[PDB]
Amino acid sequence: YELPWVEKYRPVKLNEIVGNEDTVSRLEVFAREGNVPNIIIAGPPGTGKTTSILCLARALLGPALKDAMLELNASNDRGIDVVRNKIKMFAQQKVTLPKGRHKIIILDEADSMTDGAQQALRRTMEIYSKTTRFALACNASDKIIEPIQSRCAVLRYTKLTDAQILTRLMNVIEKERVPYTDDGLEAIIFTAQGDMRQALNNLQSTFSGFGFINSENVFKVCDEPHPLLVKEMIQHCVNANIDEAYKILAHLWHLGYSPEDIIGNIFRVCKTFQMAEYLKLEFIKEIGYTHMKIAEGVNSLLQMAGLLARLCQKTM
Amino acid sequence: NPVLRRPPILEDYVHVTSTEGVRAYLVLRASSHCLWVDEFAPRHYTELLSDDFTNRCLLKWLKLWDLVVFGHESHEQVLEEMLEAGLDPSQRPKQKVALLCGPPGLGKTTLAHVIARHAGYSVVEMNASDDRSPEVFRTRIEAATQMESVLGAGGKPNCLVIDEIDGAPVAAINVLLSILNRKGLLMRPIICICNDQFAPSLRQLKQQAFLLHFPPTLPSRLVQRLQEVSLRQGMRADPGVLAALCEKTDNDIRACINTLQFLYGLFSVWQEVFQLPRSASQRFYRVLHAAASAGEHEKVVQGLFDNFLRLRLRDSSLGAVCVALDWLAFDDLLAGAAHHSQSFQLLRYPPFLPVAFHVLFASSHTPRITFPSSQQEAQNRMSQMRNLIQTLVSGIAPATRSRATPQALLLDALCLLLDILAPKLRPVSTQLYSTREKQQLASLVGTMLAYSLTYRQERTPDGQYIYRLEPNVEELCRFPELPARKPLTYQTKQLIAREIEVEKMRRAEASARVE
Amino acid sequence: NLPWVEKYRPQTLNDLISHQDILSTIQKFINEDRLPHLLLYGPPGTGKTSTILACAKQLYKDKEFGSMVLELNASDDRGIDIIRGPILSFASTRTIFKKGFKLVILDEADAMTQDAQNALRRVIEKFTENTRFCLICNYLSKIIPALQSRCTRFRFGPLTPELMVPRLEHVVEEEKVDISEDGMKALVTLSSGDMRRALNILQSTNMAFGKVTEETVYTCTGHPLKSDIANILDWMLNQDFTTAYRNITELKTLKGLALHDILTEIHLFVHRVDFPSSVRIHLLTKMADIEYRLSVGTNEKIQLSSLIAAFQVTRDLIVAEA
Amino acid sequence: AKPVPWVEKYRPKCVDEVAFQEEVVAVLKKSLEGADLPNLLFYGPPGTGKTSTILAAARELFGPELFRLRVLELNASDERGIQVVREKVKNFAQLTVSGSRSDGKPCPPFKIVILDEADSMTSAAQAALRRTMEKESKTTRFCLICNYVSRIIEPLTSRCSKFRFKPLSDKIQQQRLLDIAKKENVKISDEGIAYLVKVSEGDLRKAITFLQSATRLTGGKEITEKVITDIAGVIPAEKIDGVFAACQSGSFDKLEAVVKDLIDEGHAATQLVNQLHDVVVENNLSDKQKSIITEKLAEVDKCLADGADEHLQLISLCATVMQQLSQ
Amino acid sequence: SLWVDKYRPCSLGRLDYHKEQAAQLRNLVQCGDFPHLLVYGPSGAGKKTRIMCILRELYGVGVEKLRIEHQTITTPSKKKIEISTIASNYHLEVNPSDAGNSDRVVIQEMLKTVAQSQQLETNSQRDFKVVLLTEVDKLTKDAQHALRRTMEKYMSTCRLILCCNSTSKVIPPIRSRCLAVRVPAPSIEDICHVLSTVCKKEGLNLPSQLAHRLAEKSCRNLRKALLMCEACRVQQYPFTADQEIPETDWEVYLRETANAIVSQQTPQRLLEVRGRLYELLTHCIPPEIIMKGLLSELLHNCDGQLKGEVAQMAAYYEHRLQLGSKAIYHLEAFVAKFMALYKKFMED
Ligand SMILES: Nc1ncnc2c1ncn2[C@@H]1O[C@H](COP(=O)(O)OP(=O)(O)OP(O)(O)=S)[C@@H](O)[C@H]1O
Ligand SMILES: Nc1ncnc2c1ncn2[C@@H]1O[C@H](COP(=O)(O)OP(=O)(O)OP(O)(O)=S)[C@@H](O)[C@H]1O
Ligand SMILES: Nc1ncnc2c1ncn2[C@@H]1O[C@H](COP(=O)(O)OP(=O)(O)OP(O)(O)=S)[C@@H](O)[C@H]1O
Ligand SMILES: Nc1ncnc2c1ncn2[C@@H]1O[C@H](COP(=O)(O)OP(=O)(O)O)[C@@H](O)[C@H]1O
Ligand SMILES: [Mg+2]
Ligand SMILES: [Mg+2]
Ligand SMILES: [Mg+2]
User: Fold this and answer.
1) Where are the domains of chain C?
2) Cβ-defined contact of C77 to D282 (cutoff 8 Å)
3) What is A254-305 written as a DSSP string?
């Protein structure tokens, strides 16, 4: 009954988080000081918004965490009566708290809440701010209204640079003494894409699945289109060759890959490909157009063939 | 060579003919206790941060409401004139309810609270969509108002301050309208706050409500107030980051005070896109990471559309503007299709829209990057034009509304109508007019009675009067850069207006006589 | 009696074939008790429900199967309500009998909104040592990346014909049908690696035409033969516009073929032809334009003549190149 | 009585009244002795009588006593909602009676449900229909009726037996419409009947509705070519000759004249695409000219399917047939 | 009162143009089983004249006694939407396209409501009643699917008359069961005929040449022609052949837009013309109408070897404006491509 590595290697203090260094340092300044403002943390998944908010709440409250901290989440019902009752009478309650430490309402996945939920949120966070402070977590700030981002301090978490993902990955691997190859670990970076929980789960998964951490094992337990094949496809589309890229297309189509994953890996490889900048812009526009062809419901091999033809003709 | 006219030796082949037929074959193989927004709340009128015209106007409105609850006896001049536009015989103002609106974080709630505390009113708040049923809204709407005070020898009264009724369900605004239009009578002032002015639930409210649309705050008083906050809190006085920060948040007090409280974006991304810093793949990856970490792409793209042509472009093929327009339209197409197909896989491309601009408009010259977006003003103008044309087509009686489409009315049947309604008439009395002018006036008054428009007097700010249209239909017909036509005179307009009112009592008397 | 698809659902981890790695890893997970939450994704009809049901029947007896496995799919209403209903109520509780982890089997899991996926991924985090989820989906790309960061993903992939023949031979041995040598080739080609369509089309042409040949299954299914597409492409590259247009509209009216299948078979025929590279770029661009052009609801004859039109430009180009 | 339209009035009723569709009779005749069948899907142009064929077929499989109790007939374009797909079929399969009849004849113990015009459903509704077919594969059999193949999705067509329904192809409809004309005392010549056959590509129901409309407008007068050209949605041929005469040679002023003279007439641009395509693929133009014109006609029909403006696209289509005809 | 609608015809015999279609519709409504109608044609051709004329011929005297009703509907999201209705005691007339994304909601609910309403004294008046769907073309797909469901289920008691233009976006299977009535735009001679009639009734002596100018500048739109005639009467009663016709402000604004385009081919002039395009777009006029006006005022200037590519790019950017969601990007892309092609044209 061993715990998974996502929850086993969760940080317990605020200096173990490698996401955004200035924001983490200012959060630690507020943890040692006490008067934490209303904060909202935005960014891609896996950057560590939940562990930053949880570690801030723990380092603030301590032993009074079970009564001075309310964690409302997406798996719980968040209707109009919930923001009318649960959040309100948590914000109205009294807790014997120190001079600087304040009550915390951890509102994880605030972008999934309805409009009336945020309508009942706004007055609560403006009025009861002498006692309770809201630490919102979210993925996209567009689904949240502008007034909540106005009354909060917005903390943009970036997608993680691969170096800090490597440092945490050597920390976990040295904690487990799991053998590795280097290129397999770079394959784990490529499978992560700024999602650190995805990197940990894929490493976990892959070792339990197949011993040595080598490109073959991680690319077997994931089964995305291979970076070398799609990179050679885009390279064959660079020098105006429809046929040589079409053997790679038939290789990736007779392997049973769905067209959505094919075009997603095509765009992700085309993001970092070494070619001319205007040519990269035209390629990204055509890959986007074929991706709307896919998303509208035309998932044939001939749409991939037409994508290859358009990338070939745009290179003279 | 892939094509041979000779037949293959031992493989499969496909024939190919032409219009001539050569037949070639192909192989098939409490300092630390409260926020900085709470300790720096103005407790008196002297330290307010809003437009002085708006504060004076609301103070004068709540100073003229004191008649019936205490017993004591340009757009700006339009607002001042409807402030003093008479009084109802039951001593209420003609503007019963206020509808202050605008963007978040300026201080509408703070202004309303300190004005209510200034005008001898006990403050009482309301969130509208907090309790979203008709019945609880009805109970609070006849409990917060329509009541005296329990304390002592009267004490002080209360005025209802409804917040967040922009998102209120339509039954709540219907209950508020039915309690406003009763003629048991509404006596306490109601101060409503709405974030979106053009919400469809709020359209019937404005037609009766007082309107105080908030202008944005001037950055100079913003900078000196933020400097006062920094010197009081012991922060270092660096006004450049204060001015830039306040430019980034569109002059929102909550954002800058919360950010400077946290400290102890838009313009950086725009400056990286529109000017190279003092390999090309390095700045490509830098602007890609900057556009990925920018997050909010709607305002970024909206500001990029209002700045990409203002640069000093020397393009002799206008090719870059065409490519940037194709990129912007591609982003529009992709956002619409990702809304339609509900796919999150398409949401990784609009970060490549500003990056593309850095490949196209990497002007070395120091760019005049303008923060206000004209696309937002154009959207607001289109929206208020849309409300005006629905108001106009609601004005028509069903007889003609039936004969034509509002689209056809706007495109083909309104400017020519105005041109009909602006004839050449001598400025003489109606008795001195001839018979032909009399039946022309009869035709004009019939057209106005069928269309339900009239002429209403208003005070020009020079001290004299002028006559305007009742729905003011010229702003959706005429255009600013046209050769201006001669308008009608004062005397003709006022004699036509008395003919309008005379025909109105005329038709009222005949409808009473028939029934 | 029943159709052959429901009569031979592999009940044993021995009966199923061509999924031996998924078999080995899942049995290795389930013998040592290291099974994580599973996310089984691939094409339809490659046996996603069969392997997880046989694994759940391998773990538990029939007398305890009702309290250790809960099966849901999209036949019920799915959204934010039934994730806060049966799923976490099954997941948060213990076992009525003995001890061990539980199982939730969610078929066609890509049909829920991302709010429901966020609720379910938090439910997966909250209860893990007592509940092991199994989400079966068609497309991976309809699932939020955090949910893919919880449950290990298994790709079934295509059903290769060299391990698709003997199960069809076994249902041939059990149920006597008149099937010739082209029958297996047309079954493994026409069903597109989906064995649910194989045993449905086998019953369709057994009930319909009795004997199973290439011609019987191609006439019942309405697919065009390779000779038909060879004749179509020969008319497009050989005759003039009136004659080729008349020939193909007569053939399409007589045989009842559909332009989408004609386009697919023509595309799988073009890369056999040794076209010049620019001519093949022209053909693939125009044919992808036509296949997007049918997807909105245009008139089929006009796009048919557009395909003939593109091929007329190509035949003028190849003769002009010759 | 009520005025019945002559499509469902004149449809076949029995099994052998289907006008030479004996294969559809024979497959079931085999299924009578076999007492087992998979899901069915009948695709074909309308007026053929797929619904009446399956109604008489289910009457043969169950009898008039069991027809109103074991056959549920629903129209899919009348039941496009995802709720009524996922509730009424579930309620029909949950209410089960035995497969034994009072006559003593053997009967297979599965239900019969019919979904007519299933091609008009969307992708999500057809996916929910696939789910309903998946969970009810033991106690209720599914049959569908449609006019086109690819409008039905691939998972929905992968679990059914596909049957093409051929209509009365040639030389039977003209005398049949003559019998309808003589029965209702309708005067219409031979060329009008031939034009009625020609305006509908293999569709009987279109021809009966056009004859009904023409007889309603005339009321007892002669059915000329002008009335039939008006009802059937046909641009008159002299407009196409004027378009080709303007686009053959000259200036852009005459094209604008004929395009603004074709939109003003009220003609749909898709009808111009269809008829201009018909007169390009049959004429004596060059192969390159025919190809360029027909590819642009397909592109114009694409963007008209996407809701673009007809005026500008007929301008551009006439511009490229001018650039192909003048050269 | 304006003469554009004061001298509107009432009976089918007092129509000025399309007499044969008038007789065909009169003999169609003379007998029973009046079918579902789909009336179509260009704007201003007189579709609604035929529709209230058909309503006059189908019923008795009380056909023009119209009034506005307001009906609320509920979306699946908890929000009330108030819709308008032009109605009489014999017929219904709804514009259902004003509700954008909730068009399926009104198309189900409102016609379910008027179908469940019972015709009081139904034996006296006629068998059924008629429902007008004034703007029906821009309804979405499943809204029109619910529309043909509504047409199928109440075929005995409620027939519909759908009025629109450009039926390409109207779905196929509603056109199959609806009798298609096509009203062409009246010719120059018919427009001159009705202008001469509306002047001869009102004691006017309009010359024929000015009637030809009014017809040729009305672009086959009779309401706009009568409005120009009215405005010409207001401007000057002695009518000369050389008369300045008061054109509408948006056409001459498009003419100034076009000459601002052809004056200069620089990004600063592109900024100015983008401001003019914003001023045009803010008046809630459709961008296809702006595109058509730009192409009509643009083809009077460009050379004969460049009209074809300009027309193709006009169709291309109108189509992509229809596919997109914001008009100004596609419009100013069209203007930028025209400037680039023209500066290539004069540069070489
Ligand atoms: N910056 C980080 N440093 C170290 N470990 C991290 C970091 N970010 C994430 N992790 C690990 O990833 C796990 C999941 O992190 P979370 O904070 O839950 O992700 P998240 O930010 O909440 O994104 P969501 O909730 O999936 S949208 C944690 O339990 C850590 O083990
Ligand atoms: N003069 C001032 N100086 C400093 N802070 C002020 C001043 N006036 C108000 N504030 C603070 O700034 C905020 C004022 O904005 P609010 O009125 O609360 O929000 P709002 O302007 O109504 O916009 P929304 O839509 O409600 S977010 C409050 O937190 C006040 O405490
Ligand atoms: N590897 C296999 N070996 C033998 N039979 C198989 C195999 N894969 C599929 N089948 C057969 O296919 C039938 C259908 O399998 P299912 O598991 O229901 O399909 P599926 O993978 O769930 O795809 P769905 O349900 O349409 S998303 C089974 O009853 C088996 O008879
Ligand atoms: N015979 C006629 N006599 C007088 N006016 C007519 C006649 N035919 C059409 N009209 C005028 O033409 C205009 C056409 O407008 P309308 O019927 O709304 O067409 P659309 O619906 O296409 O815009 C009407 O305003 C009508 O007054
Ligand atoms: Mg989180
Ligand atoms: Mg507010
Ligand atoms: Mg299954």
Assistant:
1) 1-159, 160-223, 224-314
2) no
3) HTT--HHHHHHHHHHHHHS--S-HHHHHHHHHHHHHHHHHHHTT---HHHHH
